[PDB]
Amino acid sequence: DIDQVAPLLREPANFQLRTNCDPHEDNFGLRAHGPLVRIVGESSTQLGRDFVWQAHGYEVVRRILGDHEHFTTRPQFEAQFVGQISTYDPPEHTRLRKMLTPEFTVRRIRRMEPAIQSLIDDRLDLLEAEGPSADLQGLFADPVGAHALCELLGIPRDDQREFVRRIRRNARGLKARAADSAAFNRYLDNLLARQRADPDDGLLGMIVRDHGDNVTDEELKGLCTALILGGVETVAGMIGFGVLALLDNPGQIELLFESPEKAERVVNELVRYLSPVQAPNPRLAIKDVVIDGQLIKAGDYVLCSILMANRDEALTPDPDVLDANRAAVSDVGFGHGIHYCVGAALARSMLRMAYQTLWRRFPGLRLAVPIEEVKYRSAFVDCPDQVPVTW
Numbered sequence: 001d002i003d004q005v006a007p008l009l010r011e012p013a014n015f016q017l018r019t020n021c022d023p024h025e026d027n028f029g030l031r032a033h034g035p036l037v038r039i040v041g042e043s044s045t046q047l048g049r050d051f052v053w054q055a056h057g058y059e060v061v062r063r064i065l066g067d068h069e070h071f072t073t074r075p076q077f078e079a080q081f082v083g084q085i086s087t088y089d090p091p092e093h094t095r096l097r098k099m100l101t102p103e104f105t106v107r108r109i110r111r112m113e114p115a116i117q118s119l120i121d122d123r124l125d126l127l128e129a130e131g132p133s134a135d136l137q138g139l140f141a142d143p144v145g146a147h148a149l150c151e152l153l154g155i156p157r158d159d160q161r162e163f164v165r166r167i168r169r170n171a172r173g174l175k176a177r178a179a180d181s182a183a184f185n186r187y188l189d190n191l192l193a194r195q196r197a198d199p200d201d202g203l204l205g206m207i208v209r210d211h212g213d214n215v216t217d218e219e220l221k222g223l224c225t226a227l228i229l230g231g232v233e234t235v236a237g238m239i240g241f242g243v244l245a246l247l248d249n250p251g252q253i254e255l256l257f258e259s260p261e262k263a264e265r266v267v268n269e270l271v272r273y274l275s276p277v278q279a280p281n282p283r284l285a286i287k288d289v290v291i292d293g294q295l296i297k298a299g300d301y302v303l304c305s306i307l308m309a310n311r312d313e314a315l316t317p318d319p320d321v322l323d324a325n326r327a328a329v330s331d332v333g334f335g336h337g338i339h340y341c342v343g344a345a346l347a348r349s350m351l352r353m354a355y356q357t358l359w360r361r362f363p364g365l366r367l368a369v370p371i372e373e374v375k376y377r378s379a380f381v382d383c384p385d386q387v388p389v390t391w
C-alpha cells in the first residue's frame, strides 16, 4: 500500500521550539501534513542530505524507534564514541546494555533514595534561603540532576562540586574545551584505577566487579559520558518543566499526594506531556523499508519526534491536556525498543520525590514571572533556562 511521496516541506521557523511547555504551533502545522513528512532546512544540512524524513505521529515514531533491523544509530565517520551505548546497534549494543541493567534495578534505586532525598532537601533549603524570586532551575533542578548523577557513578562527595562544574563547562573556544576534556579524562582515569584496584558498590565498582577484564577503561569512560549526557539535563528538564506544567494545571498537584499509585501516574503523565528528549538520535536507514505508505531508502535519515508523537490523538484522547487521571498508555517519552531509557526507573523515583518534597515544603509555590517571560535552553535535551518562583 504505497501513497504519493510525502511532500518536501521547508523547515518551519519554530521547528522544535516551544510555547511555554507545549510544541510551538509551527510543529502542529507540520504534523497536519501527515505522520511522516520530508523536511529541508538546517536539519538536513547538518546531516549532509538534501532532505530528512520526520516521523511525528505516534504509531510511526514508536515503530521506527524500535526498528533495529532497518535502522542504525551509529555515527558515520569513531573512538570518540566508544562506550556511547545509544549509538551502538546489536550485537555490540546488547553487550553494553547488559553491563548497565544490573545497576538500574528498582532494588538498587530504593537503596539510593535516602541520599537522593537528602540532596533534594539540601537544595530546597537553599531555595528557601534565597527567598522570593529564587531560580528553581539553577538552585534546585540543575544541581539535583547533576548531583544525582554524581551519586550514581560514585563520585567522592568532596569532588562533586568540581565535577559538576566540569559537567557544565564542556556542556569558550576549542582550546579551552580541549583543556576541560583533558582534565575530565585525567580525573576519570584516576577514578577507574581506584575502582579496578578495590571495587566498591557504586555503578562503576559493580561493573568492574562483574566484568573486570571483560570491559575496557575506554568503554567505562564512554559509559560514564553516556550516563551524564543521558541523565543530568533530562532530570533537570523534567523538574523545571514539570514545575511549570503543574503550576499551570494546579488541580494536578493534589494527585501527587493522593496515593503512591496516583503519584506514579502524575510523573508518567508529565513525561508524556513534556517529553524533554524531544528528538533522540536520528535514525539512519541501512535497508529500504516501507512505512505507512512511504518508501524510506537506505541512506535516508529519519528524525523521530517523541514530543509530537506523545501529543497524537492516536495515543490518547485530549492529548494536549495534562491529566494524570487519563487511562495509562504506552507513550514514547522514555523511548521504545532496545534503546528504551536505561534510567527510567531512577528518573521516575527521583521525580516523584522532587515534586512531592517541593510542594510539601512550599505549598504556595507560584511562578514569579509572567509565563511568557520564561526562556528555554537550546541543546539536545529541552530544559527551562531560569524558573523564578515565590511562595
Ligand code: HEM
Pocket (backbone or CB within 6 Å): 065, 085, 086, 087, 097, 152, 226, 227, 228, 230, 231, 232, 234, 235, 238, 271, 275, 276, 277, 280, 281, 306, 332, 333, 334, 335, 336, 338, 339, 340, 341, 342, 343, 344, 346, 347, 348
Ligand atoms: C525523565 C528523564 C529522562 C527522559 C525523559 C529520558 C529519555 C530517554 C529516551 C527518549 C531515550 C531513547 C533514546 C533513543 O532511542 O535514541 C533514552 C535512553 C537512554 N537514557 Fe534516558 N531519559 C531520562 C533520564 C535518564 C537518566 C536519569 C539516565 C541516566 C542515569 C538516562 C540514561 C539514558 C541512557 C544511557 C540511554 C541510552 C540507552 C541505550 O542506548 O540502551 N536517562 N532516555
